[PDB]
XYZ file of C-alpha atoms in Angstrom:
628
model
C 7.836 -14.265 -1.194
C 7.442 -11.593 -3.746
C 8.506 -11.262 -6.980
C 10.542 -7.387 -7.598
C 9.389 -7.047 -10.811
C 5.901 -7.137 -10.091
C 3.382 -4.509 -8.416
C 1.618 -5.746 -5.026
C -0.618 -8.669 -4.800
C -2.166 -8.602 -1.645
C -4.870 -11.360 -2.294
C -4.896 -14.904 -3.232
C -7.695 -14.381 -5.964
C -10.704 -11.793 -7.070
C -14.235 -13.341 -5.977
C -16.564 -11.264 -7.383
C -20.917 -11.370 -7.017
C -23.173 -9.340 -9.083
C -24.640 -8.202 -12.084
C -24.508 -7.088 -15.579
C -21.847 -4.400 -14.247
C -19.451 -7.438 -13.345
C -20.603 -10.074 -15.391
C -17.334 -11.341 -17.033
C -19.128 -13.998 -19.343
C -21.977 -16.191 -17.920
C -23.654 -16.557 -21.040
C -23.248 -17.456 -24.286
C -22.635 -14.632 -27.161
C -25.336 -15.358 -29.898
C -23.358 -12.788 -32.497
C -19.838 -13.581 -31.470
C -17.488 -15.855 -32.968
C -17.775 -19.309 -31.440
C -16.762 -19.977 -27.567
C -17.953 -16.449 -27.452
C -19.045 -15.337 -24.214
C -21.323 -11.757 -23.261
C -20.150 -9.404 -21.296
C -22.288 -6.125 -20.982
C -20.407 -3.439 -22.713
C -18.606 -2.602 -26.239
C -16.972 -5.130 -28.631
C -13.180 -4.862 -29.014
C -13.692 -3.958 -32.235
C -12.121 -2.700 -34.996
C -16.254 -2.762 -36.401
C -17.585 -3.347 -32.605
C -20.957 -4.654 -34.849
C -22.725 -7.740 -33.629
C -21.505 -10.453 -35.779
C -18.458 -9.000 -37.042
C -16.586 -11.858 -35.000
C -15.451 -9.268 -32.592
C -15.542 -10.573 -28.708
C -17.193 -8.507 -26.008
C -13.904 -6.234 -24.544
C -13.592 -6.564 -20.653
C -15.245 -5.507 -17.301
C -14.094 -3.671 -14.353
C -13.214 -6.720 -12.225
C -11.496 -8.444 -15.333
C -9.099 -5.409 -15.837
C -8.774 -5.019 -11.829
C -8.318 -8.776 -11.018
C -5.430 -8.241 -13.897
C -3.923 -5.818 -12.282
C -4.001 -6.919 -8.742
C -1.808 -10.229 -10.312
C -4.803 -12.302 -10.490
C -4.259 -15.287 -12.143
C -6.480 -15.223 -15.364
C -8.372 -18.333 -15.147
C -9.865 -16.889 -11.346
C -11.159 -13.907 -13.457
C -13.661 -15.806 -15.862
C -17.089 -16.606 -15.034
C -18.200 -19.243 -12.337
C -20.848 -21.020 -14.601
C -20.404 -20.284 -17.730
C -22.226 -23.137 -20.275
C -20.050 -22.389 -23.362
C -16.545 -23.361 -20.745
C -18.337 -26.115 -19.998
C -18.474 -27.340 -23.772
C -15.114 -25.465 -24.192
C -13.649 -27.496 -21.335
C -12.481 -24.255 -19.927
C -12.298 -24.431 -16.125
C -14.727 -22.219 -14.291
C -13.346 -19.195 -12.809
C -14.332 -17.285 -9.457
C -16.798 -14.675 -11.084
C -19.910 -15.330 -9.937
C -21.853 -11.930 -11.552
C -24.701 -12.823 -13.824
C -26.060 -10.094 -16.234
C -30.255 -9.654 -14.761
C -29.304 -10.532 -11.291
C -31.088 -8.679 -8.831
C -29.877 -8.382 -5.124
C -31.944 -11.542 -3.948
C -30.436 -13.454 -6.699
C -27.145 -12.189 -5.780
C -27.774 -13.293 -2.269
C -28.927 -17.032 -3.932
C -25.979 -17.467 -5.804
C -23.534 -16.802 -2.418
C -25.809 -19.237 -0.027
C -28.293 -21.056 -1.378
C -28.825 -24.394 -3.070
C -28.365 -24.370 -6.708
C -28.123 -20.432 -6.633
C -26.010 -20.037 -9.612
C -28.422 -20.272 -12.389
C -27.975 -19.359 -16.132
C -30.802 -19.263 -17.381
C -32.550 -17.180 -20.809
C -35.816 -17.151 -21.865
C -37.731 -18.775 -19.031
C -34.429 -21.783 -19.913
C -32.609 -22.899 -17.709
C -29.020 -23.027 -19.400
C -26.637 -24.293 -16.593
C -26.678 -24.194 -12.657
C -24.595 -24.256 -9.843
C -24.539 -24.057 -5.966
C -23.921 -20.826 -4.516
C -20.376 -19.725 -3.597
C -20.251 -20.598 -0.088
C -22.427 -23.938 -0.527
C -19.895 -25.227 -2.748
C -17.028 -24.334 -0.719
C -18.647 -25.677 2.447
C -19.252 -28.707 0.327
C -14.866 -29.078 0.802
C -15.178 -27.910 4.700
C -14.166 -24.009 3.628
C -15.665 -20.688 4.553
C -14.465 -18.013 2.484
C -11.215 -17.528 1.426
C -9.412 -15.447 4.442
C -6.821 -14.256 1.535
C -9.225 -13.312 -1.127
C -10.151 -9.490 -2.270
C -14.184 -10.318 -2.364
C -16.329 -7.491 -4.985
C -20.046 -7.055 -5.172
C -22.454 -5.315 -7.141
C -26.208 -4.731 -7.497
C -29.591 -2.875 -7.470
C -30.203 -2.035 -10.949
C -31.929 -4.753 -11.626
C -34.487 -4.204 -8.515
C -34.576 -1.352 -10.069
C -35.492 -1.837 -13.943
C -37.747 -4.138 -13.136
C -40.170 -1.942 -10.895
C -39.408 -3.660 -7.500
C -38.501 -0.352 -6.160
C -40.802 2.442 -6.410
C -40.859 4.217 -3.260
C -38.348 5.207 -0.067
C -38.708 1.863 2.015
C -38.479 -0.250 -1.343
C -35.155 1.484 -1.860
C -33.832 1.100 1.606
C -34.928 -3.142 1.437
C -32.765 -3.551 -1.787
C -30.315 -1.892 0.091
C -30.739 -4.278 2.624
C -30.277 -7.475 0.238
C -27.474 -6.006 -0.704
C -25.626 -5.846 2.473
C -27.392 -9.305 3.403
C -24.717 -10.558 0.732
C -21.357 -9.041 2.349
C -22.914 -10.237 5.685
C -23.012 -13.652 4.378
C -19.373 -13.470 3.336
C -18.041 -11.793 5.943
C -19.713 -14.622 8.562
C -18.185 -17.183 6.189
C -14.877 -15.548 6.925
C -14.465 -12.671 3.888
C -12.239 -10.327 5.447
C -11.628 -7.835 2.161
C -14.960 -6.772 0.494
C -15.118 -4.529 -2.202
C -19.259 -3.059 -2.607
C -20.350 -0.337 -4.828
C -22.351 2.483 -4.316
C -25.572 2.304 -6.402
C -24.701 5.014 -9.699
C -27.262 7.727 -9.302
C -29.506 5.920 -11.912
C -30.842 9.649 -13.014
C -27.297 10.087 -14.592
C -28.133 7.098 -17.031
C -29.488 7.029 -21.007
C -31.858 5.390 -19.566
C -33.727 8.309 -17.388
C -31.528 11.121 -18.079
C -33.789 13.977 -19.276
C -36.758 11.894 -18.987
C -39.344 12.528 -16.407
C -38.195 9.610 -14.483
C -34.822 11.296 -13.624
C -35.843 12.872 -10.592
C -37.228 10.239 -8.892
C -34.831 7.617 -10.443
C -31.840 9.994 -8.818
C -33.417 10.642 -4.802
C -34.624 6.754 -5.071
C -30.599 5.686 -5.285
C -29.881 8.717 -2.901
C -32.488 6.359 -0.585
C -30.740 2.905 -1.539
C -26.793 4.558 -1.003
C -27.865 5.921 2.290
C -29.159 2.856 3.721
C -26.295 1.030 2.577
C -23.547 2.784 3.998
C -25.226 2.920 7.249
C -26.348 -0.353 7.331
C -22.488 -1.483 6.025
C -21.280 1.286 8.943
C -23.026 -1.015 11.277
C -22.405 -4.679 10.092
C -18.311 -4.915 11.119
C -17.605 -6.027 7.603
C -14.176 -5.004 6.065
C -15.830 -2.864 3.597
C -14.150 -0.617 0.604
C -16.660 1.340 -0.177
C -16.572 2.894 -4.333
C -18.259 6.265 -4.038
C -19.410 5.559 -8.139
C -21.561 8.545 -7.767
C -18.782 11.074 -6.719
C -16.585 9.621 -8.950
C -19.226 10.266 -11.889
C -19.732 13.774 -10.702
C -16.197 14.392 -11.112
C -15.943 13.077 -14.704
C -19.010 15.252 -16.152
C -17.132 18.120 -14.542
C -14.136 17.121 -16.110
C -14.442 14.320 -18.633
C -11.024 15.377 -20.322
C -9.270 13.822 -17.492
C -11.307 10.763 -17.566
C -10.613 10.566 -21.667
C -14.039 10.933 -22.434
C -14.632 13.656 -24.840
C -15.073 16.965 -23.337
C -17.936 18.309 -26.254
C -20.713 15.272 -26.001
C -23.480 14.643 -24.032
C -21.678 11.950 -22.183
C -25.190 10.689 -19.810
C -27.507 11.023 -22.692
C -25.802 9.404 -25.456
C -24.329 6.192 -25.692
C -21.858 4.008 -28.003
C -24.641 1.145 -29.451
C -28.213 2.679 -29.602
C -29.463 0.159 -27.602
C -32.303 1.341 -25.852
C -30.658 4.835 -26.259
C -29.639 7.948 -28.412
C -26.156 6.544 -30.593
C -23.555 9.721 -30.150
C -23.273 10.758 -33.643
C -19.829 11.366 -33.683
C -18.454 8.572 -31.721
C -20.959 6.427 -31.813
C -20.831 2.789 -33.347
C -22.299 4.494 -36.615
C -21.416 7.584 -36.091
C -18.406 9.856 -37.966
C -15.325 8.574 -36.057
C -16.638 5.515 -33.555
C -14.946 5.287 -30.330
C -16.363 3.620 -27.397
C -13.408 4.717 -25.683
C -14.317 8.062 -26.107
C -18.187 7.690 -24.128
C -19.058 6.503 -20.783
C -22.110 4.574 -21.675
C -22.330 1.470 -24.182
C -26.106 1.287 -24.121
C -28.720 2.743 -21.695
C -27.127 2.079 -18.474
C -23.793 -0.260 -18.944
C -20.649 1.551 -19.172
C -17.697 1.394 -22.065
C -14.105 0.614 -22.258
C -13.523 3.643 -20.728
C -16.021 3.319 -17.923
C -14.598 -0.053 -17.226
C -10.801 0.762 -16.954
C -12.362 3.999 -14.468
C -13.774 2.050 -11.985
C -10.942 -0.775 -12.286
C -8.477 2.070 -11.713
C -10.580 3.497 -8.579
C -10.975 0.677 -7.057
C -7.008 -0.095 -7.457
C -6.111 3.693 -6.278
C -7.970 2.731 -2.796
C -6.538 -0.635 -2.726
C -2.787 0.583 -3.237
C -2.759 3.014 -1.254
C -2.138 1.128 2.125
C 0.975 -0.056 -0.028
C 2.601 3.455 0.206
C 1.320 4.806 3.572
C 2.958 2.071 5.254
C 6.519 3.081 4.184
C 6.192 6.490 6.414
C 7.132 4.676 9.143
C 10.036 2.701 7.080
C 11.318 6.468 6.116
C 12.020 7.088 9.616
C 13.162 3.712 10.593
C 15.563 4.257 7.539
C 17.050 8.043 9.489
C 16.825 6.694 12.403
C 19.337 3.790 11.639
C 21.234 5.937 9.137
C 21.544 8.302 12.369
C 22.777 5.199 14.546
C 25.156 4.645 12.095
C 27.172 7.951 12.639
C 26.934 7.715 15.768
C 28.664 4.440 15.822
C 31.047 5.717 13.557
C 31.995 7.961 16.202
C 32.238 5.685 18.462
C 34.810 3.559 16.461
C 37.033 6.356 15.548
C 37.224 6.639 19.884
C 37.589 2.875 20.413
C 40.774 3.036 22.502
C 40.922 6.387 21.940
C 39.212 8.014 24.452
C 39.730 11.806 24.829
C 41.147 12.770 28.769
C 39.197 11.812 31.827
C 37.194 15.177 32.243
C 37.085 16.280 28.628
C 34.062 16.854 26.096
C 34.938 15.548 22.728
C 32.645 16.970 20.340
C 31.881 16.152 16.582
C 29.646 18.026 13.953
C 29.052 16.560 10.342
C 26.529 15.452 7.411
C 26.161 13.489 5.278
C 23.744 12.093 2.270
C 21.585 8.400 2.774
C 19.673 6.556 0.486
C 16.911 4.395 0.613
C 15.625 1.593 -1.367
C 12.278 -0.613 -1.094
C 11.657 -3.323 -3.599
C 7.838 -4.190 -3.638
C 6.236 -7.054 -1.579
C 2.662 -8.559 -1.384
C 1.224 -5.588 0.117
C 4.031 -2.673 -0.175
C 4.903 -0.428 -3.054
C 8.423 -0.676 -4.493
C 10.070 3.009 -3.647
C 13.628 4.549 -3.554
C 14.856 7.992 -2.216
C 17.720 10.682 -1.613
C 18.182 12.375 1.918
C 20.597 14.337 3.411
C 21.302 15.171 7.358
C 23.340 17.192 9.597
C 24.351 15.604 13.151
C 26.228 16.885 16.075
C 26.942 15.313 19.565
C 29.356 15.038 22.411
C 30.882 12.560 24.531
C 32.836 13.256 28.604
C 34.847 10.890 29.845
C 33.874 11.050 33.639
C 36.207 8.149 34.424
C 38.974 5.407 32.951
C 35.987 3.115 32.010
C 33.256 5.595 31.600
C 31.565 7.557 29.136
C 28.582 9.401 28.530
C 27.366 11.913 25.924
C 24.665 13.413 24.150
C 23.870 13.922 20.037
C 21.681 15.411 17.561
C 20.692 15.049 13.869
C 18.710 16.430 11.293
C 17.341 14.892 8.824
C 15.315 15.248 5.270
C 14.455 12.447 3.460
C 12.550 12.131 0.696
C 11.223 8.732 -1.288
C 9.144 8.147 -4.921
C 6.972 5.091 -4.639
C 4.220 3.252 -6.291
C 3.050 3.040 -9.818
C 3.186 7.199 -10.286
C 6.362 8.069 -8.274
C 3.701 9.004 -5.104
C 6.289 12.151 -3.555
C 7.062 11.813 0.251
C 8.850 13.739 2.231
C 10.125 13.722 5.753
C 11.806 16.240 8.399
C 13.118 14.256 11.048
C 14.640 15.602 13.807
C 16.797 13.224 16.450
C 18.589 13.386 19.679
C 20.046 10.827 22.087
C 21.767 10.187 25.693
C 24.448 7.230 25.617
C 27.220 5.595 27.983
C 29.661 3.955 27.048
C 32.200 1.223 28.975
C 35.868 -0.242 28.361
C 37.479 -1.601 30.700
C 40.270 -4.732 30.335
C 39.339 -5.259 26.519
C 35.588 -5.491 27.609
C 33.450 -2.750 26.139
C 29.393 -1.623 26.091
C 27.225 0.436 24.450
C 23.894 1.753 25.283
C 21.961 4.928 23.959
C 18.661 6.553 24.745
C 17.315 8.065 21.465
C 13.886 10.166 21.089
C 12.778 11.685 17.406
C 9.782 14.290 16.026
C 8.866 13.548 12.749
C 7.223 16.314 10.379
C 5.687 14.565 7.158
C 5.413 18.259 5.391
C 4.750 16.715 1.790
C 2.849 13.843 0.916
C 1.517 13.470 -2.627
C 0.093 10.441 -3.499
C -0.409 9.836 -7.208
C -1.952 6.790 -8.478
C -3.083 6.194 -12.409
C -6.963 6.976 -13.642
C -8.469 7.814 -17.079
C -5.275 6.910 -18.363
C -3.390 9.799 -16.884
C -2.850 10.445 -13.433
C -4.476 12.082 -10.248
C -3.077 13.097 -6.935
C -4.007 13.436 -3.221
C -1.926 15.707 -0.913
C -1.291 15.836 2.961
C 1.040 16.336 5.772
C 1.077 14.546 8.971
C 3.476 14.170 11.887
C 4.880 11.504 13.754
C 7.511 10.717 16.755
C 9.672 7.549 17.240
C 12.009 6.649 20.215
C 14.615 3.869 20.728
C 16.620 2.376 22.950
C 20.183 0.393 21.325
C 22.825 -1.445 23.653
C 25.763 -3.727 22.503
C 28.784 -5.452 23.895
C 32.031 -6.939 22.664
C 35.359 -8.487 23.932
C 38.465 -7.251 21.957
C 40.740 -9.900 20.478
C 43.688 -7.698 20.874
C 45.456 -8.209 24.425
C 46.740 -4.799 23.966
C 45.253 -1.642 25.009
C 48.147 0.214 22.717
C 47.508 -2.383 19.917
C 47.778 -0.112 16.432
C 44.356 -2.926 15.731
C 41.064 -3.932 17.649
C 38.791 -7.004 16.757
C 35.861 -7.629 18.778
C 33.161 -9.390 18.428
C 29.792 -8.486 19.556
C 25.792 -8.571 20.091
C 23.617 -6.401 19.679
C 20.289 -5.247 21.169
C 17.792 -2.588 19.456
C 14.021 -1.705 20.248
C 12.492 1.188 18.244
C 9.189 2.324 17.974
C 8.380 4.505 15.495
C 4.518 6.260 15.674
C 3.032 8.165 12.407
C 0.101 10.270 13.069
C -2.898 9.729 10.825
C -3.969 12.820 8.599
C -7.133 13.469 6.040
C -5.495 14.416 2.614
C -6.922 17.277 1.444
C -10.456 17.898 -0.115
C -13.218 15.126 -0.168
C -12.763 14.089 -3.956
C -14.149 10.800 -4.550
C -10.273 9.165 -4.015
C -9.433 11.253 -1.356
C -8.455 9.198 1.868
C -8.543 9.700 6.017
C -5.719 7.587 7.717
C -5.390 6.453 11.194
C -2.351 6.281 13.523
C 0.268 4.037 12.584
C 2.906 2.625 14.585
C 5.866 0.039 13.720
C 8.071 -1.120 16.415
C 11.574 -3.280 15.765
C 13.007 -6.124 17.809
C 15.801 -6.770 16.572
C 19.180 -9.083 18.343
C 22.395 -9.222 16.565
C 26.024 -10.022 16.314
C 29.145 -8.723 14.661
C 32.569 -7.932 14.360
C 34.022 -5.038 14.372
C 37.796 -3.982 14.069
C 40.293 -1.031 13.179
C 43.944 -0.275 12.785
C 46.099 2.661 13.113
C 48.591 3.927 11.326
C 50.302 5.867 13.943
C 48.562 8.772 15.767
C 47.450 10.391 11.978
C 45.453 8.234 10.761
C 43.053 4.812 11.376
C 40.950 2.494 9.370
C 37.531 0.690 10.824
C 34.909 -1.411 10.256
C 32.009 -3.897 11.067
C 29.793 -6.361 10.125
C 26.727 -7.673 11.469
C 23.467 -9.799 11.109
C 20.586 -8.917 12.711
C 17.217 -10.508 13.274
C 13.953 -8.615 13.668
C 11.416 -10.093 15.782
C 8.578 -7.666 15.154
C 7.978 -8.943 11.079
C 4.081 -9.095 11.119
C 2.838 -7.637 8.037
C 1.489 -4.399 9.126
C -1.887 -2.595 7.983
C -3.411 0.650 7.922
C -7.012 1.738 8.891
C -8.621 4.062 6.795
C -12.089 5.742 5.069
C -12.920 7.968 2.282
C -13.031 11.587 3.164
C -16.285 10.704 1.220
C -18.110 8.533 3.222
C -16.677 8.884 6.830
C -18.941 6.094 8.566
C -17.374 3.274 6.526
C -13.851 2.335 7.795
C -11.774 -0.929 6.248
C -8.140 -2.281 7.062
C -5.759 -3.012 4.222
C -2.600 -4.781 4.517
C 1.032 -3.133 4.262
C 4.722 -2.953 4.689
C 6.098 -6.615 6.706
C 9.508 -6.309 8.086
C 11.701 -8.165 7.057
C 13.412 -10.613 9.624
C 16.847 -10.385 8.472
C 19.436 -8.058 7.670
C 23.478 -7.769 7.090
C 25.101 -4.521 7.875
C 28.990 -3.256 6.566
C 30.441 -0.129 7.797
C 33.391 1.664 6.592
C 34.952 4.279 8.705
C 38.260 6.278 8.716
C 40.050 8.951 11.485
C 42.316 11.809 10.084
C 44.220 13.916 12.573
C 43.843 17.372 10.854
C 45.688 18.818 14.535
C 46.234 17.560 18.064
C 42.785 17.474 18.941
C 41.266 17.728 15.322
C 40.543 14.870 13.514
C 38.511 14.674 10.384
C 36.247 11.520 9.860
C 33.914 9.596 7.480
C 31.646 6.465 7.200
C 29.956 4.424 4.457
C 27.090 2.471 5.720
C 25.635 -0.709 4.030
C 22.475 -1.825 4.964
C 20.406 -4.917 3.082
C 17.137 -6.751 4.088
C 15.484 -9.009 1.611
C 13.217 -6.654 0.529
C 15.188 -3.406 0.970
C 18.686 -1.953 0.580
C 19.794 1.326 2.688
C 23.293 3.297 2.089
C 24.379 6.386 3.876
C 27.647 8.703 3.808
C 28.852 10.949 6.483
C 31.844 13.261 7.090
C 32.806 15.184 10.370
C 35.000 16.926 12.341
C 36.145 15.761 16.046
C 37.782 18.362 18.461
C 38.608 17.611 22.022
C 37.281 20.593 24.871
């Protein structure tokens, strides 16, 4: 039911659980204007100072839950005393700034868990997530995208000083997405700890050391222990990711020349940057990574908004490869049938190979849906075949195509490209104005380019691979001509149809283990599909002969489909994401004409229509028909 405007939107809402890293605005903000709320990173600005009536700018989940399609009011926070007096409605982020992981926990189970409170005050309170949802007979919400933070806290405030204390935060941690997954969470989004060396905080201190092998401890525990809970788990490798911006802050847009872990945009608690600083030269937060000692800009924000989005979309594009060859596969049926009109009564002699060779161009178009990328291509293909008439009624024959197809989808124009390579065995009856179709069709399927671009630090990155595939099919149809006349100069005959096709893309690692960079599993899409048309022709005497069809079709295989995958990062942790759905109907035209060129020669071409609700496919073809 999706809007083609609009990018994917997979889930229902965003419910997030944390801490100051997700907090979108629990409490109040003493130095903003009023209805102010705090969020833990830089003012908007233009002055960014406290009390310049300038509102704290976003956080990752706010700018993600906006791009996901959201709806705005599910992105604010869950308890919130200022919407209270505001009479703004709660929203579904529950991520208090101070929280550490038992509190998290307390604010997903237990009894009055949400609490608000500053200054040994309590401010405003709330049951926990699930406690208020089972107070309405709900679990989770099956449909929601579910994101968690936490372990700084346990952190700052001493509660982990050694190995095991590491590895039990970790443990809190995952007690949270164990909780939500039991409740029936089926999409959970959990960061890695940062490696809290790489923070104003420690960095260059004496603490560093230990601060960076004591969230080596916590990360480790947490992907095994997530490896072995069965939770549908999207890992964000923040430490990778963080790696790969000191190396190259440029393509983050954080300035390449500054001490980008040492400095920071406030001076809270940590060395301003001069330069960009909020009283420095030229400020820009955008231009740092961290606001104060350990919470993260603008920048920072949009980064791990973006990476989180670039794992999530991804399922949206993978799940066309199979659609690609579905598309050639049809386009190829579609020749073939073209064929097959231009010889409706028409049949070369009993004994005699007719044989055909031709091209042609196709085009395929995807508009987007919940969980599928928009995407259109060009493609081109080269098919040859032959039919022998071993009888009056019978026919039987064999063909061949070629084809490349290529398609630009997703936000970036993702490139993919496809070698497909066809052949079939068919029969074919008329007999008495009675006639049947029925083919035997295999495929190999070489993916050799596959570039998946997706947007981060507001220009673009890319993953690359190659994969391979196969598909095979099996199509069968039968009509009764309206014409009484086997010499009739016009056919019309009705007609159902019959298709099964399974198509089967191998999974492939792209390239590399960058912190984006994704492993894929098999995928396979198969098509039911029953139809009925009508198809019909005239000739204009020996020379020359017009054809064409229509038909409706309904596909019986239109489950949404999803794709299995892990970062090349962190093998152990494997999650599901939902993709393409097939559509359950479609219409088909075809437009076909037969040129005698020479006894025995004849020179023929096809226009193909093809339209689902989410999808239109066209394809051309020309050929030449000689009789053996």
């Amino acid at each position: 039911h999706h809007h083609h405007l609009e990018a994917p939107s997979p889930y229902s809402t965003l419910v997030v659980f944390g801490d100051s890293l997700s907090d979108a605005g629990q409490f109040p903000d003493p130095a903003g204007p009023a209805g102010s709320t705090s969020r833990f990173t830089n003012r908007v600005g233009p002055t960014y100072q406290n009390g310049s009536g300038e509102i704290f700018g976003p956080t990752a989940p706010m700018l993600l839950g906006n791009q996901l399609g959201i709806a705005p009011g599910d992105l604010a926070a869950s308890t919130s005393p200022v919407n209270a007096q505001q009479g703004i409605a709660d929203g579904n982020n529950w991520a208090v700034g101070g929280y550490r992981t038992d509190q998290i926990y307390d604010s997903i189970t237990a009894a009055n868990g949400s609490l608000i409170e500053r200054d040994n005050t309590l401010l405003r309170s709330r049951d926990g997530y699930l406690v208020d949802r089972a107070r309405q007979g709900l679990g989770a919400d099956p449909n929601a995208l579910y994101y968690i933070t936490g372990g700084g806290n346990d952190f700052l405030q001493g509660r982990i000083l050694n190995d095991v204390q590491a590895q039990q935060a970790a443990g809190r941690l995952v007690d949270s997405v164990q909780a939500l997954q039991q409740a029936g969470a089926r999409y959970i989004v959990v960061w890695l700890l940062p490696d809290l060396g790489l923070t104003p905080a420690t960095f260059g201190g004496p603490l560093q050391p230990f601060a960076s092998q004591l969230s080596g401890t916590f990360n480790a525990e947490l992907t095994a222990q997530l490896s072995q809970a069965g939770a549908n788990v999207i890992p964000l490798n923040i430490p990778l990711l963080l790696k790969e911006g000191m190396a190259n802050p440029a393509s983050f847009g954080l300035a390449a020349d500054q001490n980008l872990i040492g400095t920071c945009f406030s001076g809270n608690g940590c060395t301003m940057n001069p330069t960009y600083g909020i009283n420095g030269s030229t400020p820009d937060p955008s231009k740092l990574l961290f606001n104060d000692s350990v919470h993260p800009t603008i920048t920072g924000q949009r980064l791990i908004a973006d990476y989180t989005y670039s794992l999530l979309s991804a399922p949206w594009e993978l799940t066309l490869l199979p659609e690609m060859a579905h598309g050639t596969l049809r386009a190829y049926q579609d020749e073939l049938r073209s064929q097959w009109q231009a010889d409706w009564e028409n049949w070369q002699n009993v004994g005699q190979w007719r044989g055909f060779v031709g091209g042609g161009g196709q085009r395929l178009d995807f508009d987007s849906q919940d969980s599928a990328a928009s995407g259109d291509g060009n493609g081109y293909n080269l098919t040859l075949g032959g039919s022998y008439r071993i009888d009056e009624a019978w026919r039987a024959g064999v063909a061949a195509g070629f084809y490349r197809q290529k398609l630009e989808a997703g936000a970036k124009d993702s490139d993919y490209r496809m070698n497909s390579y066809m052949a079939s065995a068919f029969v074919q009856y008329q007999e008495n104005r009675w006639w049947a179709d029925a083919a035997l069709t295999g495929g190999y399927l070489d993916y050799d380019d596959l570039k998946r671009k997706f947007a981060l630090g507001g220009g673009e990155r890319s993953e690359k691979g190659d994969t391979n595939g196969h598909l095979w099919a099996f199509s069968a149809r039968l009509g009764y001509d309206i014409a009484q006349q086997a010499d009739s100069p016009w056919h019309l005959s009705p007609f159902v149809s019959a298709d099964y096709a399974r198509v089967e893309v191998d999974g492939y690692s792209e390239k590399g283990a960058s912190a984006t960079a994704l492993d894929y599993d098999d995928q396979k899409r198969s098509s039911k599909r029953l139809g009925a048309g009508l198809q019909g022709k005239y000739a204009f005497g020996s020379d020359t002969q017009l054809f064409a069809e229509y038909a409706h079709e309904r596909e019986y295989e239109d489950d949404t489909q999803d794709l299995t995958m892990s970062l090349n990062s962190l093998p152990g942790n494997r999650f599901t994401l939902e993709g393409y759905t097939p559509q359950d109907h479609l219409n088909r035209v075809s437009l076909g004409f037969s040129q005698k060129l020479a006894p025995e020669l004849s020179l023929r071409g096809g226009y193909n229509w093809r339209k689902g609700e989410d999808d239109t496919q066209q394809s051309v073809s020309l050929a030449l028909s000689l009789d053996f």
